[PDB]
Amino acid sequence: XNXXX
Amino acid sequence: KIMRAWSDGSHLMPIVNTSLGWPNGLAIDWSASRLYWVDAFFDKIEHSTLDGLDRKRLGHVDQMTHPFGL
Ligand SMILES: *[C@@H]1O[C@H](CO)[C@@H](O[C@@H]2O[C@H](CO)[C@@H](O)[C@H](O[C@@H]3O[C@H](CO[C@H]4O[C@H](CO)[C@@H](O)[C@H](O)[C@@H]4O)[C@@H](O)[C@H](O[C@H]4O[C@H](CO)[C@@H](O)[C@H](O)[C@@H]4O)[C@@H]3O)[C@H]2NC(C)=O)[C@H](O)[C@H]1NC(C)=O
Ligand SMILES: [Ca+2]
Numbered sequence A: 001x002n003x004x005x
Numbered sequence B: 001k002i003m004r005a006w007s008d009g010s011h012l013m014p015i016v017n018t019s020l021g022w023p024n025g026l027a028i029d030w031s032a033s034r035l036y037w038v039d040a041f042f043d044k045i046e047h048s049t050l051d052g053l054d055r056k057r058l059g060h061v062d063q064m065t066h067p068f069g070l
Helices: none
Strands: B002-004 B013-016 B023-029 B032-038 B045-049
Touching: none
Parallel strands: none
Antiparallel strands: B002 B013, B023 B032, B032 B045
16 A cells, blocks of 8 residues: 555 | 744745645755655655745655655
């Protein structure tokens, strides 16, 4: 997805 | 959306809010004074004037599929 890890 | 404001943080306003998905990265072309961004949903690099006018899109980059920073 686009979340920071 | 990609928003612009005074360096004070006031006058916050959208300048790019059409055809955007996951605008991960931003950059400035100091020579030409043009804002660059990049999408991770549509996988495209775009650039425009600091007002969000004169929007252009770069050509396809071969294997770029999730660009984060530029
Ligand atoms: C998506 O992003 C766009 C911008 O790309 C936003 O649209 C803009 O919303 C702003 C709201 O803060 C406005 O600056 C702007 O809308 C108006 O701009 C007018 C400028 O006057 C000239 O242009 C109009 C164009 O229709 C023309 O008719 C006129 O004759 C002039 O040539 C202002 O006049 C207008 O003022 C009106 O609204 C304000 C409140 O906002 C009142 O206080 C005034 O009394 C008056 O009724 C207004 O400022 C928008 N520009 C565009 C491109 O439409 C969207 O809002 C963003 N949407 C989302 C979902 O994020
Ligand atoms: Ca993708």
